[PDB]
Design a protein around this ligand. Structure first.
Ligand code: NAD
Ligand code: 9ON
Ligand code: 9ON
Lengths: 289, 289
């Protein structure tokens, strides 16, 4: 399988290295020389333009920052692709942009999936990413052998756009929980209830969630959590702020009522103005702002 | 086998007291609602004419009462009647401030005292699977264990007087926020065209998982035992969640803490309780459609 990998940044570089490692021929493009060089260093044949990379590919993967850039990439390469090429967008973009690029690709006789990922740079390097997939079941089946060497988990969420919608709904919940857990720790501390006690109760009770059992925002109860390491990501406030922006786009596009999700989004946008580089659990310290 | 006075023989007290009788304790009951008292007598509680009489010959006094004010008043009524160094356990859910006040009052009368509020509701009470979250001295809890075990699935020592109440109220605030957030996610998914089943599968397999979805799923289908499938019959009523959120807001106000989402969830539940006090708190999903 020949794969064109368009977007060889912090996530795209290690993903493409895993594809090389699993015996694929990987062709690449990235407009940053340092990204492109690094990728070429791990066996990717790097081209000057995206249409060139796409020319001989059976699979085209995108990992790009915004739906506008994904859309532009598609209209730039689709005429250069061979018919029935499999396009997989693993960018995190709005559900609307997802469905539009899906329709665009299929109108050219291509097969297309949205497959955004959770797990970060660490997961990308370790080939444990979670792919949340929208599109036809039979297209996902064809894609499976390409996704497997990058992935710890592959979930079919529904029709085109469903992968984006699933990830955005999960991350909106996550942001709310990380804030709620932080509020609970600071309340407990003011009430004279130790962090370890609150942790022991909440993790054995209805309030338990990853935000506490793994990402506990106070040092001590979970020695590996970012709070014990100067809030080094982990999952950065910058990235969380990006997902919540998308969640607010989806809320605006649908007219949905999302009071706590929107409030979380407000909170994280403000926090990202100061602390974008810290793990999102660091929000515990911006509560008095 | 000791003698226990049980003051408050209502929805929670009646089944609690029945388990104490079944374990071989002599249980001396008082409740001024004759209906509650009658029901408790039927399961073997010896019912007295007055709270001071029930407590006069008890090693342990348990209160399971509606509010801090009622607990305070009850203590004021009975403490001088109890024998010196009688062990008072308050399993009512009351403010942390109220707990500390009643605790100090009990001790100024020469009584041992714990706060031991519970989770599990009436089904937990009947089955003797309640979780007791205990504040007070470790040695008093040691003295109390034989009495709490027949009623309990879990007994956890949370810290000094008031810490049981604190732990509960912190957990329940988180829970209220999670239940709204999950509701928001499911409604947003529906608007995006992502199925409830698929959102369920994703969130429960991802970082957003929590009891509010995996057990209390607010859409019918994915968890057939959740209230959504049984006309939102509680479960954990909106009336009770609204009470616990009032207590959290008392704690927030007493401490000067900042709890944006917890307070926003308090406002949401206070509004929903005006008309849907009788519905499971997962029914708040209704306000988002
Ligand atoms: N019901 C639940 O599902 C649940 C779950 C967890 C915790 N709780 C908490 O348990 C406590 C009791 O709940 P409940 O559902 O049994 O309430 P309830 O109203 O059914 O019972 C309270 C009982 O106390 C009696 N009472 C009032 N004043 C009294 C006095 N001075 N002496 C003796 N008895 C008196 C009332 O007459 C009543 O029968 C509350 O603080 C509640 O928040 C309830
Ligand atoms: C096992 C996994 C793909 C194989 C892998 O990359 O670990 C999956 O199918 O979810
Ligand atoms: C909660 C108690 C067990 C009593 C029971 O199983 O009912 C204990 O293990 O301490």
């Amino acid at each position: 399988t020949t794969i064109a990998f368009l977007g060889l940044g912090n996530m795209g570089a290690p993903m493409s290295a895993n594809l090389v490692g699993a015996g694929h021929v990987v062709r690449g493009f990235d407009p940053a020389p340092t990204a492109a060089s690094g990728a070429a260093a791990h066996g990717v044949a790097v081209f000057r333009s995206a249409p060139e990379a796409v020319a001989e590919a059976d699979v085209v993967i995108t990992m790009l920052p915004t739906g506008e850039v994904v859309r532009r990439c598609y209209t730039d390469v689709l005429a250069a692709a061979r018919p029935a090429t499999l396009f997989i967008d693993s960018s995190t973009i709005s559900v609307t942009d997802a469905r539009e690029v899906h329709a665009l690709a299929e109108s050219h006789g291509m097969l297309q999936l949205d497959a955004p990922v959770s797990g970060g740079v660490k997961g990308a390097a370790a080939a444990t990413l979670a792919f949340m997939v929208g599109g036809d079941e039979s297209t996902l089946r064809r894609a499976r052998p390409v996704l497997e060497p990058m992935a710890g988990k592959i979930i079919h969420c529904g029709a085109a756009g469903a992968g984006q919608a699933a990830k955005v709904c999960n991350n909106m919940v996550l942001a709310v929980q990380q804030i709620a857990i932080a509020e609970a720790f600071v309340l407990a501390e003011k009430l004279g209830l130790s962090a370890q006690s609150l942790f022991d109760v909440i993790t054995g009770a209805t309030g338990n969630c990853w935000a506490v059992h793994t990402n506990c925002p106070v040092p001590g109860p979970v020695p590996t959590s970012p709070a014990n390491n100067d809030f080094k990501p982990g999952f950065s406030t910058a990235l969380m702020n990006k997902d919540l922006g998308l969640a607010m786009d989806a809320v605006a596009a649908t007219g949905a009522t999302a009071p706590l999700g929107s409030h979380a989004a407000d909170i994280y946008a403000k926090f990202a103005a100061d602390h974008a580089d810290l793990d999102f659990s660091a929000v515990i310290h911006t509560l008095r702002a």
